């Protein structure tokens, strides 16, 4: 129940079919900032590790980043010294079979600047890593801030009340109406 | 004020009437003159259309005074003799 | 020694609590003038700091890590 640093799933050293990447059951929602795949693809362990290192370097030691998927699915390739048709090749790499709509990385820190709605999110690390992923990506930020708590609505209502009051005083002072 | 509901503090928002009397001969009347110009500016007229502002050049010899009547109905008077940028002048002279 | 000297060591309310009071109206019946002036100063400070964070390009660590979460 306390916070923990769960160990990563291990690499399965079992030959498996190339197969197809099944679709996502539904939207994946996580508070904070998320980088979400937009098309299906299989991301290599090297690519995931590079993205993690870049995210850590950009954000800093004081901030924590969660890698949502892991490369456990084996993928094989033949040695150049083997002829055609002599069975499947040796394991060559490991991949995560990311569908469309799957979060790759996310940071759970909520945006503190609720009263500054015009300051839109900082996606610096996501921008740094996106052009290197083999998947198109979309940047998301969800902070559980609902419009019922919006401060801009109160600001607008106050401005409207002030305007109405000003027009009322101007009319009264000029005295063209009862 | 940006990203805020209520306006930045202004000492004219909740005043009903303001009258500034001052004499052109006495020194240290520039603060009174600046106040008169500000309260007669159209910017104050648009910001606080409720405000009534008046001023007078005293023929008699008396210090610069400001009388204020609040919306609640209270009345106050104050001496406004002072230096303003004359302060900066005196300081540069001192050093 | 002056009476106001005694209250200096007592910490003042931070921008978070002042915003709770004024932007959200939490306990606004007990708001004091000094509190509003402090809120007005700190709100402008935060505006300027966010503007600088957005228009920041150097490697300097002069930005508090809190503003990088905007």
């Amino acid at each position: 129940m306390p916070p923990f640093r769960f160990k990563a799933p291990q690499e399965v050293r079992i030959k498996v079919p190339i197969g197809r990447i099944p679709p996502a059951v539904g939207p994946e929602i996580r508070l904070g900032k998320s980088i979400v795949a937009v098309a299906p693809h299989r991301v290599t362990a090297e690519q995931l590790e590079d993205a993690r290192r870049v995210l850590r370097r950009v954000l800093g030691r004081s901030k924590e980043v969660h890698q949502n998927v892991h490369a456990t699915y084996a993928v094989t390739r033949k040695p150049e010294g083997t002829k055609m048709g002599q069975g499947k090749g040796s394991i060559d790499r490991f991949v995560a079979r990311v569908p469309a709509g799957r979060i790759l990385f996310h940071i759970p820190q909520i945006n503190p600047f609720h009263p500054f709605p015009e300051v839109e999110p900082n996606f610096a690390a996501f921008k740094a890593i996106a052009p290197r992923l083999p998947v198109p990506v979309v940047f998301r930020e969800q902070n559980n801030f609902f419009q019922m708590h919006s401060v801009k609505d109160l600001i607008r209502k106050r401005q409207a009340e002030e305007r109405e009051n000003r027009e009322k005083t101007a009319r009264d002072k000029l005295g063209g109406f009862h | 004020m940006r990203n805020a509901i209520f306006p930045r503090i202004d000492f004219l928002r909740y005043l009903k009437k303001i009258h500034v009397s001052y004499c052109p001969t006495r020194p240290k009347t520039e603060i009174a003159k600046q106040l008169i110009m500000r309260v007669t500016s159209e910017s104050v007229k648009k910001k606080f259309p409720h405000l009534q502002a008046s001023w007078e050049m005293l023929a008699y010899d008396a210090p610069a005074t400001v009388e204020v009547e609040l919306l609640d109905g209270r009345r106050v008077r104050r001496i406004i003799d002072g230096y303003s940028k004359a302060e900066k002048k005196k300081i540069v002279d001192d050093w | 020694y002056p009476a106001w000297l005694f209250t200096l060591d007592k910490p003042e309310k931070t921008y978070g609590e002042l915003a709770m009071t004024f932007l959200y109206g939490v306990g606004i019946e007990n708001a004091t003038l000094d509190e509003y002036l402090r809120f007005t100063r700190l709100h402008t400070k935060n505006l300027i700091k966010l503007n600088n964070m957005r228009l920041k390009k150097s490697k300097r660590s002069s930005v508090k890590p809190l503003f990088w979460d905007a």
Partner: peptide, 26 residues
């Protein structure tokens, strides 16, 4: 300075009244 600060101290009551009325109404 004077004058302005004293008057602002006087008017903080009405400022608070307006703030409370706004928050209560909304």
């Amino acid at each position: 300075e004077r004058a302005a600060t004293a008057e602002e101290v006087d008017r903080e009551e009405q400022g608070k009244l307006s703030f409370a009325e706004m928050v209560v109404g909304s």
